[PDB]
From a paper:
Two lysosomal proteins, [name] and NPC2, collaborate to export cholesterol from the lysosomal membrane. Human [name] has 1278 amino-acid residues, including an N-terminal lumenal domain (NTD), a middle lumenal domain (MLD), a C-terminal lumenal domain (CTD), and 13 TMs. Then, [name] employs its NTD and MLD to bind NPC2 and transfer its cholesterol.
To enhance the signal of itraconazole in the density map, we synthesized Br-labeled itraconazole (I-Br) which contains four cis-stereoisomers. The structure was then determined at 4.0-Å resolution from ~210 k particles. The isomers are indistinguishable at this resolution and they have similar interactions with the binding pocket; therefore, we built a model using the Br-labeled cis-2R,4 S,2′S isomer as a representative of the Br-labeled itraconazole mixture. The I-Br binds to a hydrophobic cavity that is generated by the SSD, the MLD and the CTD in the center of [name]. Residues in the N-terminal loop and C-terminal helices of the MLD and the CTD, as well as TMs 3, 4, 5, and 13 contribute to the cavity that accommodates I-Br. The terminal sec-butyl moiety of I-Br inserts into the cavity and is contacted by residues W381, I609, L613, I685, F1087, I1220, and Y1225. Superimposing the cryo-EM structure of I-Br-bound [name] to the crystal structure of [name]-ΔNTD reveals subtle differences between the TMs and no noticeable conformation changes between lumenal domains. Calculations using the program MOLE confirm a ~120-Å long tunnel in [name] with a minimum diameter of 7 Å, extending from the bottom of the MLD and CTD to the SSD. Our structural analysis reveals that P691 is located at the exit of the putative transport tunnel. Itraconazole may prevent this transport through blocking the tunnel directly.
Author numbering: 24 to 287, 334 to 641, 650 to 796, 814 to 1255
Write the structure that this text describes.
Amino acid sequence: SCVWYGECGIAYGDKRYNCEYSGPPKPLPKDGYDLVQELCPGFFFGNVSLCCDVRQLQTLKDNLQLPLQFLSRCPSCFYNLLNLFCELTCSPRQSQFLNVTATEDYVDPVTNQTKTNVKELQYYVGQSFANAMYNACRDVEAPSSNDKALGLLCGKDADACNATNWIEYMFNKDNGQAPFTITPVFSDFPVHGMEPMNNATKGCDESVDEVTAPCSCQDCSIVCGPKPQPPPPPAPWTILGLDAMYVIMWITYMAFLLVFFGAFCLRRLFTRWGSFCVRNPGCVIFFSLVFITACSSGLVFVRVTTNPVDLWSAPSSQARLEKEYFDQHFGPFFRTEQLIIRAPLTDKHIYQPYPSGADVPFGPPLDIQILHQVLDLQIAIENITASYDNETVTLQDICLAPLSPYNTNCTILSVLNYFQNSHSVLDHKKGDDFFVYADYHTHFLYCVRAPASLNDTSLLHDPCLGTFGGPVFPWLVLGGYDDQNYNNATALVITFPVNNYYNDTEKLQRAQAWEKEFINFVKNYKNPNLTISFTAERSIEDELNRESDSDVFTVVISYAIMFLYISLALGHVDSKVSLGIAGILIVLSSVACSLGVFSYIGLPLTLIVIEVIPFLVLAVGVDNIFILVQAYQRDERLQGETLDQQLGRVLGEVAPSMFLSSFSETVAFFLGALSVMPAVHTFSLFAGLAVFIDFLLQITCFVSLLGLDIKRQEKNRLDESCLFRFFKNSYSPLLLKDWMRPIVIAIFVGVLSFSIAVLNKVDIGLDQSLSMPDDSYMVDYFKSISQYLHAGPPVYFVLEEGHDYTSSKGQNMVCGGMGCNNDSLVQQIFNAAQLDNYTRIGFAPSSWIDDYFDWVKPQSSCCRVDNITDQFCNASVVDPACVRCRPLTPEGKQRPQGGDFMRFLPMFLSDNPNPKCGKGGHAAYSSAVNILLGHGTRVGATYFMTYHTVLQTSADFIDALKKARLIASNVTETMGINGSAYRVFPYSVFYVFYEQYLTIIDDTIFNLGVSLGAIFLVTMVLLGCELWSAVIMCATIAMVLVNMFGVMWLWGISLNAVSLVNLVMSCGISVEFCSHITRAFTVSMKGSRVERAEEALAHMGSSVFSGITLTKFGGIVVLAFAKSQIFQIFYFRMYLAMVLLGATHGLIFLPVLLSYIGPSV
Ligand SMILES: CC[C@H](C)n1ncn(-c2ccc(N3CCN(c4ccc(OC[C@H]5CO[C@](Cn6cncn6)(c6ccc(Cl)cc6Cl)O5)cc4)CC3)c(Br)c2)c1=O
Ligand SMILES: *[C@@H]1O[C@H](CO)[C@@H](O[C@@H]2O[C@H](CO)[C@@H](O)[C@H](O[C@H]3O[C@H](CO)[C@@H](O)[C@H](O)[C@@H]3O)[C@H]2NC(C)=O)[C@H](O)[C@H]1NC(C)=O
Ligand SMILES: *[C@@H]1O[C@H](CO)[C@@H](O[C@@H]2O[C@H](CO)[C@@H](O)[C@H](O)[C@H]2NC(C)=O)[C@H](O)[C@H]1NC(C)=O
Ligand SMILES: *[C@@H]1O[C@H](CO)[C@@H](O)[C@H](O)[C@H]1NC(C)=O
Ligand SMILES: *[C@@H]1O[C@H](CO)[C@@H](O)[C@H](O)[C@H]1NC(C)=O
Ligand SMILES: *[C@@H]1O[C@H](CO)[C@@H](O)[C@H](O)[C@H]1NC(C)=O
Ligand SMILES: *[C@@H]1O[C@H](CO)[C@@H](O)[C@H](O)[C@H]1NC(C)=O
Ligand SMILES: *[C@@H]1O[C@H](CO)[C@@H](O)[C@H](O)[C@H]1NC(C)=O
Ligand SMILES: *[C@@H]1O[C@H](CO)[C@@H](O)[C@H](O)[C@H]1NC(C)=O
Ligand SMILES: *[C@@H]1O[C@H](CO)[C@@H](O)[C@H](O)[C@H]1NC(C)=O
Ligand SMILES: *[C@@H]1O[C@H](CO)[C@@H](O)[C@H](O)[C@H]1NC(C)=O
């Protein structure tokens, strides 16, 4: 039996009384079921006769509105007090825990029948129920603050208000919700024929249903595990120099015993060529120019060069295989247009809130006297137009709108997009001139805790959601905050996203035409308030083509010195001048011809090779000239033979040595063109063919016109073993004495023992910020970005077509929370989020599959399907005769299983954010999931957008890649797929530019090793016999490039593809200093090997040393007027540490080994 019923007259305003009626319960109306099912679901079962009507519940839901405004966070905490009020409104047990003390009469103006108001009663309640409620609801965090939600509802300090006094305060009429006081009796036992309410409860740790998730420990920190820390650092410093400083000690012992050991076919085939070349040098010169000019006229047909940024991965590589999934499926990745704002002039600020005292410091840049000027600049940038094809272009035609056909507010991720980018909304001062209750400070403080919630709970009714319909995040907007709270902000971030659409080409430069005006405006700007830095994602590329056009003058003068040196260095007033200039025209045309061939073939000429190859072909091609003509000058003419037979003899002498040096490295490059890195793949083709066609040109063109020079010097008019043989005959023998031969082997094995030591500390990855001019705005940006932001580039985890999404497991593989499996996708993203320094992934996954379930949840009151045609009624329409989507049934409260799931899905995808509902799907998930029509319906690819931490250096990017791929493959195998039909590969903007660095250490051990293996093989073909003649070459070519790895560390040079092409250069140029001494050693008619080497030194070695000084003096001219930094950091020190380290181990070290293990016939 119940105590009262109905609604008696007014106490004051809207607050009414109840009417006394101590009889049987009343069968509820049919239309009242929709309220009682939502409010008191623990009563609607079996018989429906309770002691309430619809009007009590109608006013009662209005009475407890503010508890729903505060206690919407944890549903279980609200559920406990909801159980209390249900029992107070219409329990059938009201005769058991209620005793009415005061009763008043009442007169009705309408019906005139004398009724009875309910004045005052006693509520017998369980004490343990209050304790359970308090223990479950003590730690509920209030919105826009770090205090308790009870504090606003206790009417006092939150820490001192107990369960008991708070329930008294809730029952009190002073607060302004309850009509009159309800006197409680806090007991746990039957006292004098009463049965107090001890109805069952559930604490905030425990859920009431499956769909109701356990209240996450931001508001109930009773039972959640601590922030875990499984970074185990592995152990370095094991093999430092234990096998370096104690391996050379055996060298200083084996080489020390020698200190104590004292105690006792082709000439016939080149002479015959050289004969014909000298007999008729009229036609053979004509057959050179025609063949060149024919093969060097195809360049003008193509001459194409590739300068996008993505030229650093092969189009069949895995990176671009992943990237080219985004042309058909869900479009491109959007560019950014970042613009960082900060103010050093403005000082700190302190805010003091009104009702409670919890002062909060605001940083410099977010004060109103700055924010007006920030908004001025903000609105000024959207008033920027450019011209394409002589038509105007504005921002709205290029920037994306996440929901486009409804409205076309362009997207801006400014902080002022919390304030909807307006002036009048800023200064909503609520209150009198004396004090202010609510301002932009508290609104800003509320709008950072929940960026999706439209209607703010403050005095204001300002939407927090962005102007473009999408939630502006606190991640992408603020900078230099102390990692949790955003009130200490010191840098504003402005972002203008814009489309790409790769399959189109006519509307990309359309956008770049705007972006140049964007830069042109932001550069030409003056402001004493604040300092700015900016970045367009075209401007990462523009600075390369700006900076690269600043070292044309430095280097043409570098080649001029090499052009002048060839004149001076031939002879001993009748020196060889003209043929030096002719010899330049050979190599300068040879390299042009080699580019002209492959131009017609169709391979694009990169910016790497264009300056690297004219060093190579010159530095190799001229060393043919310096050896040949000096070998001619060191020969004397015989008694009975003319110049023809002389040149044939000396050609047959020298040329078979030279043929090896040409044909070895040439073939070494074309058998080192099998790597797939497209900077080194495109180099070796040119590097091989240029020197190939060069060597085929000196044998044709150069030697034929030497006779003309001898004819010219026979006439003794213009257009003797004296120069170095005096020097080398004095310099040579002191090396090969017993006095110095242990020293120069001990030092130059010591440097190998030094170079083998620090190979562990070989530096990997190019630094991004060491490729810019120092005076640029970009270097200022790369200083800023590493200093302020906490959320770098986004990453997408794309799951391909093939997965179910209908059956339970279909959900459970991608499911997240609400009583679900702990090995799912978004769960594993969420587990890796806290371990940001371990695995470089910043923050929450923010998926659609969980939000969709909240949208299709029966208590949403969001979606309404039409009664007759199944058309989607809008959430903000009057709703006259269209019905709920999911029938409000306990079996129906679960997530959908059949095709109704995918039947309801497109209506979610076509929903704008309405105030009565949540955000919907079409705001931020319109491009998220692909729909496919056929076999009913089907769903395509899904991606879960999350953000990486701030990344600054080369180590960070590759560290992010490895662990992103680890996470993907970890969940792939755990997900339990049949075959390799679909993966969960990650994607970002930069996973093409840093895939090659993942496998740089593998392919170089292939590439240089195979090139080195080519030097082993072809010399066996060229030298015929003598294995030990080729092994000693292979050893010295190995030992020079390990010292090249040594000098990488010694200066601090990275191991990028830009350095790898100039590293494989060493394999091609070091053989030049090795063959011309080895052939000279293997054929020499002396018995004893000691004096045999001096022949090889004095006859060939001097002319080799004469051919290093041009590149030696071509080095000094680079640094003497060095302008750029990228050219100075790789392409200076590599050449210097290649010439001065190759020539050292070539013509000083090697003869000493030839005096030790010198073979003979
Ligand atoms: C976040 C990732 C981000 C996207 N990212 N990461 C790495 N990179 C990147 C991309 C490309 C590059 N490159 C690599 C090669 N760079 C380079 C550096 C020096 C370098 O020598 C300077 C050369 C040359 O020609 C000239 C001038 N010229 C004249 N006509 C055409 N050009 C030149 C000079 C002498 C002679 Cl005889 C002939 C020439 Cl053609 O000056 C030539 C090229 C040029 C720049 C770099 Br470094 C980094 C990025 O963009
Ligand atoms: C970063 O933001 C936090 C937000 O809490 C700042 O902490 C607050 O610092 C200011 C200055 O002290 C105050 O608002 C407040 O400190 C006050 O707390 C005591 C409590 O009894 C009070 O008596 C004093 O008036 C004192 O000023 C801090 N707030 C809290 C909740 O602790 C923090 O200082 C900011 N960081 C920096 C570097 O400024
Ligand atoms: C985004 O679009 C909404 C409308 O869908 C804009 O709201 C109104 O815009 C008009 C100007 O078109 C202005 O009077 C106000 O800004 C809004 N009206 C009212 C009554 O307040 C909104 O301005 C758009 N956002 C931006 C940044 O332009
Ligand atoms: C900026 O807006 C003002 C007012 O609408 C207008 O006079 C001016 O022409 C605009 N600027 C440009 C570059 O179009
Ligand atoms: C360019 O556009 C302007 C105005 O839109 C017009 O007057 C002019 O004739 C155009 N010029 C050309 C070459 O199309
Ligand atoms: C926000 O909620 C309050 C609660 O009373 C209401 O007055 C106001 O109209 C709501 N705002 C909007 C924009 O509907
Ligand atoms: C910012 O500069 C403007 C220039 O008109 C000036 O009016 C304003 O006082 C400056 N701000 C501050 C905080 O001094
Ligand atoms: C997931 O939960 C089950 C049941 O509690 C447990 O056996 C399993 O170890 C959990 N998974 C992981 C990865 O710990
Ligand atoms: C992890 O990195 C963050 C940078 O966002 C830093 O604040 C924090 O100190 C790091 N964690 C540890 C344990 O050092
Ligand atoms: C809601 O639906 C009605 C149906 O006529 C439509 O007029 C209105 O534009 C819709 N609102 C939104 C925000 O899509
Ligand atoms: C919905 O349709 C059914 C049958 O088509 C009908 O009985 C019912 O009255 C309709 N509901 C409304 C609100 O018109």
